[PDB]
Amino acid sequence: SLKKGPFVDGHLMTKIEKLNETDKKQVVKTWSRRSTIFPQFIGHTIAVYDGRKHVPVFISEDMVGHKLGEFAPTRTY
Amino acid sequence: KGPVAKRDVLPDPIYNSKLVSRLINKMMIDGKKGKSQTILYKSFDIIKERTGNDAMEVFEQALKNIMPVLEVKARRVGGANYQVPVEVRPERRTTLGLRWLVNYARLRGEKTMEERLANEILDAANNTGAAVKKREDTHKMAEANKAFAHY
Amino acid sequence: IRIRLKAYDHRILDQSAEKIVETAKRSGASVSGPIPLPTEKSVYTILRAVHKYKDSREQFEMRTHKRLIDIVNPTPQTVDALMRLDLPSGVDIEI
Amino acid sequence: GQKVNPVGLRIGVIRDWESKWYAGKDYADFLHEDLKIREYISKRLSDASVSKVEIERAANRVNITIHTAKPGMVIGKGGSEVEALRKALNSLTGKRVHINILEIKRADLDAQLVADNIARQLENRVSFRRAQKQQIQRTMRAGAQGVKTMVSGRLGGADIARSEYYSEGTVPLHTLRADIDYATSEADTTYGKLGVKVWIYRGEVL
Amino acid sequence: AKKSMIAKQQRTPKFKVQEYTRCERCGRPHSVIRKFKLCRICFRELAYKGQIPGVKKASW
Amino acid sequence: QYYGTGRRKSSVARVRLVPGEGRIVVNNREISEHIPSAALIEDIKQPLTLTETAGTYDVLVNVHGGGLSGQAGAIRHGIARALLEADPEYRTTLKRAGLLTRD
RNA sequence: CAACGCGAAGAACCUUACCAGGUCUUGACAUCCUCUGACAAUCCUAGAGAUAGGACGUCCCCUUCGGGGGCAGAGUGACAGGUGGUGCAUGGUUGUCGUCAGCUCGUGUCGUGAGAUGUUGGGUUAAGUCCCGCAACGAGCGCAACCCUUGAUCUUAGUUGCCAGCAUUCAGUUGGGCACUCUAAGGUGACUGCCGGUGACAAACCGGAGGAAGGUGGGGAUGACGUCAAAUCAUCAUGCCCCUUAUGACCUGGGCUACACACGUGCUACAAUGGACAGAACAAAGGGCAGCGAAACCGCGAGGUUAAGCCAAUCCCACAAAUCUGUUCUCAGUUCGGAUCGCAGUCUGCAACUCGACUGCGUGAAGCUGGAAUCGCUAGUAAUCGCGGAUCAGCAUGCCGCG
């Protein structure tokens, strides 16, 4: 995405809006590693499905410039 | 079986010579005959400039100097690995002279292949030269292997 | 006014061209002869083997002979004649 | 690796195309439709002993030529057979389909039906020698410059499967102008699967 | 798992991008052909059997 | 209008040797305008020097395909062929060159 | 040898088989049986979705009233599935000897026998091709042959090809010609055809004129009996064995792309036949309909916007680069190489993060020719520079071909 606008899943955006309209609260589980981090993601300890488990990650300010997969490794060693 | 024929292109305005045409065919890399032609032309021009003489005679004398008369061919008769001197036909002599000229010229090492070939032609006209070192080594080997002039 | 043909059948296309030329000339239209346009062709490479042996290969040839016929005189008689002319389907007559 | 069949090599030399039409934008679609038609007609007339079936595209009309070698078994009364053969194709294809039926004279010469009969005799537990020899004699008396029949697989053994050759006359596969009729057949027996290979040399064209 | 794979190929994909090609005769991916939509061995055998009016033996 | 075709390595010389003064046109261009590295220019006239035809015929050609060297070769080959077809008197002399290679 | 740029002619999901997780069990898929009637198509929740909770909504038709032609569902079991095993059970398809020239059969003879004679001996050829002799006479599979391509010519035809003679054009663009390349058709031609010599006078070989073509003109297709219990149960079928509310099926994600490693194949480099910049010429083949996309504008850029034209000798892809003529640097780990690398962007696609390519910015190492040993190449071959297509929404140093 270059000028079409940032990228995010509709269901995840709706969940985040519902959770932010009143106050940030329990983890928001989702399988959308594709989603790009926005300023709204700040404060929400989102969870990412790495394939076998959900890894809760606290999204800070500087996370806007990365994707959830950048914080959700998959390979093991 | 048997031998095979061949031919080349003689005409060359700068110092017309069949051996010059063969040299042009040699030293060529990557199918770039124009580069070799230009290199030879500029080298002959530099030769004519530095030395007040036609480059044709200098090239002929360099070839006469580098041309090897006797070749030392290896031969394994038993566990000895002997060698046999051989009389080189003029064609093989010219080809060997061209090979040595080109190889030692590019091996010398200077700022341009033009100057390298010019200085090589000079050190060939004057018997003291790199290709003449190869000539002398080959002659020494042929002399040391004179015991087998004929089987 | 023009008409073209496209066929993979050498002799069938030749015969169709000859027949159309005759039918168009018999009425005095002065139609130019069949124009031998370049034949479009293609080739496909396939492995003779099933699983292994990449080196084993075959080549299939595809050829289509295209020709053009341009009428010189209107001659609606020739138009009706060609309209009522029936030829094989291997040429796919096209106007 | 071994020899190649003459059916794909003799095209353009003598043998004409079993499919004669010029298509566009629907080449693969028509090819698949014709493949399905051939599959269905073969599975239906498998008992009628049909050798081959050619098709011709006629601008939304399809002309099908069938070589059966026995008309009374493919047309029979004329009406019931033609209905059952044409309306089924029409319904399964979606457009008009015209059928033509030719009869193969000397039915013992076409490789397709020859291999079909050999496979039937094998499935009938007939010895692989008697059937082969009888079919070879039948073809030779019917008239053919050369006949070659090969059967490979389990001919009664379990540990080993081997081939058998039986041919009389001249079968010059390397001669381009030979009009050799080639066809294959399969026979699924209780001991496994048997494959019948038959290519018959009928004559050369000058 | 061959006819199951054929049914999966025939399934209506979520996105058109998710569509993949099959030769429509067997279940052989990995170099199915476009112009004929027929499998390698299938197309070869069919061309040898006189079908495919356009394709013949090539020589150059 | 004598005509000739100097087919060589995909480079065809559509040469028409017509009586002129000696002008050589290459795809509607001059000799120096088209071909640098005149080492080949003198070679083109090899047969033109073997037989005295200096300035009696003009050479108008439309050379399509091939590099500079291949184009010059096709040009001289077509020149030789057209000159032979025009006057075969010197064919006995030009048979020792031929210039036909099927390259 | 005949595995290792091989299946697989292009792994973000899909392809995907394998795995974590969420699931189902006449099942994803095809025949069976009883019915109730069209299914679809829009919309909210869970969703990752499988799938459900569901609402809007179902318009099926044909007949002389039974019924029939599909689709969905609701129950039953016959069944389905097997990328599960066996290529030491197989069909089918290919690799090797091998494009090597041999392998065989009918009759007759000999040997009490397995077997030989034909196929041995002499000459000769790419050939067991041919000739002579011949206790043997004939024949088949082979080999050359006729098949295709190219090298030259007569004729048939000049539009979407060509432009000379003619007149116009900034353009071959116009009137005009089919002279001519050219293309696509019928023929011819090269077939030891002719002469000398050799050889047995023959088969056969050297030279000689013509000719495009001289001794299968070059290349492609064509792979003789059989060997390797050769490869493929994975393209397909396949008997046998095994699972079946699971060794079957649906979906999200992951893996198929990890590397202290070693080895095959290929590309790039180590520089002066060189590096960077200015100017210039020639291409051959192939593709174009949700496809190919002129031209114009924007942007250093990859590329984006409007859009001509083309179902194509018309129009486009698509201005080939090597190369040449100049300017410039100078022998250095460098004005060499661009890998690894940080950032900013472009093509596509729901999304290039595990996971493409490309572009600009700033750097830039390994590397200065590489051990035993080893590989390909006898002419338009080697070496080397570009071009197009397959697989493809988007992906090629590999593949196919061309110059």
UniProtKB/Swiss-Prot annotation, chain B:
Record's GO cellular component terms: cytosolic small ribosomal subunit; ribosome
Claim: DNA-binding is one of the keywords in the record: no
Family annotation (Pfam families): Ribosomal_S7
Annotated GO MF terms: mRNA binding; rRNA binding; structural constituent of ribosome; tRNA binding
Function: One of the primary rRNA binding proteins, it binds directly to 16S rRNA where it nucleates assembly of the head domain of the 30S subunit. Is located at the subunit interface close to the decoding center, probably blocks exit of the E-site tRNA.
Family: Belongs to the universal ribosomal protein uS7 family.
Keywords: Ribonucleoprotein, Ribosomal protein, RNA-binding, rRNA-binding, tRNA-binding
GO terms (BP aspect): ribosomal small subunit assembly; translation
Organism name: Bacillus subtilis (strain 168)
InterPro entries: Ribosomal_uS7, Ribosomal_uS7_bac/org-type, Ribosomal_uS7_CS, Ribosomal_uS7_dom, Ribosomal_uS7_dom_sf
Domain of life per record: Bacteria
Protein name: Small ribosomal subunit protein uS7
Keyword Nucleus applies: no
Subunit and partners: Part of the 30S ribosomal subunit. Contacts proteins S9 and S11. Interacts with VmlR.
UniProtKB/Swiss-Prot annotation, chain C:
Superkingdom, taxonomy of origin: Bacteria
Pfam families according to UniProt: Ribosomal_S10 (PF00338)
SUPFAM superfamilies: Ribosomal protein S10 (SSF54999)
Keywords: Ribonucleoprotein, Ribosomal protein
UniProt entry tagged with the keyword Ribonucleoprotein: yes
Record GO biological process: translation
GO molecular function: structural constituent of ribosome; tRNA binding
InterPro entries attached to this UniProt entry: Ribosomal_uS10, Ribosomal_uS10_CS, Ribosomal_uS10_dom, Ribosomal_uS10_dom_sf
SMART domains the record matches: Ribosomal_S10
Cellular component, GO, one term: small ribosomal subunit
Chain's role: Involved in the binding of tRNA to the ribosomes.
Family stated for the protein in its record: Belongs to the universal ribosomal protein uS10 family.
Oligomer and partners: Part of the 30S ribosomal subunit.
Annotated protein name in UniProt: Small ribosomal subunit protein uS10
Source organism (scientific name): Bacillus subtilis (strain 168)
Name of the gene: rpsJ
UniProtKB/Swiss-Prot annotation, chain D:
Biological process per Gene Ontology, one example term: translation
Keyword vocabulary terms for this entry: Ribonucleoprotein, Ribosomal protein, RNA-binding, rRNA-binding
PROSITE patterns associated with the record: KH_TYPE_2 (PS50823), RIBOSOMAL_S3 (PS00548)
Gene (name only): rpsC
Pfam families for the chain: KH_2 (PF07650), Ribosomal_S3_C (PF00189)
CDD domains for this protein: KH-II_30S_S3 (cd02412)
UniProt cross-references to InterPro entries, sorted A to Z: KH_dom (IPR004087), KH_dom-like_a/b (IPR015946), KH_dom_type_2 (IPR004044), KH_sf_prok-type (IPR009019), Ribosomal_S3_C_sf (IPR036419), Ribosomal_uS3_bac-typ (IPR005704), Ribosomal_uS3_C (IPR001351), Ribosomal_uS3_CS (IPR018280)
Role description: Binds the lower part of the 30S subunit head. Binds mRNA in the 70S ribosome, positioning it for translation.
Complexes and interactors: Part of the 30S ribosomal subunit. Forms a tight complex with proteins S10 and S14.
CC annotations in GO: cytosolic small ribosomal subunit
Domain (KH type-2): residue spans on this chain: 37-105
Entry superkingdom: Bacteria
One GO molecular-function entry: mRNA binding
Family listed: Belongs to the universal ribosomal protein uS3 family.
Record's protein name: Small ribosomal subunit protein uS3
Curated annotation (Swiss-Prot), chain E:
Gene Ontology CC terms, in alphabetical order: small ribosomal subunit
Recorded GO MF terms: rRNA binding; structural constituent of ribosome; zinc ion binding
Record-linked Pfam families: Ribosomal_S14 (PF00253)
NCBIfam families given in the database record: PRK08061.1
Natural source organism: Bacillus subtilis (strain 168)
Biological process according to GO: translation
Cofactor remark from the record: Binds 1 zinc ion per subunit.
Underlying gene: rpsN1
Keyword Iron: no
Top-level taxon of origin: Bacteria
PANTHER family: 30S RIBOSOMAL PROTEIN S14, SMALL RIBOSOMAL SUBUNIT PROTEIN US14B
Annotated protein name in UniProt: Small ribosomal subunit protein uS14B
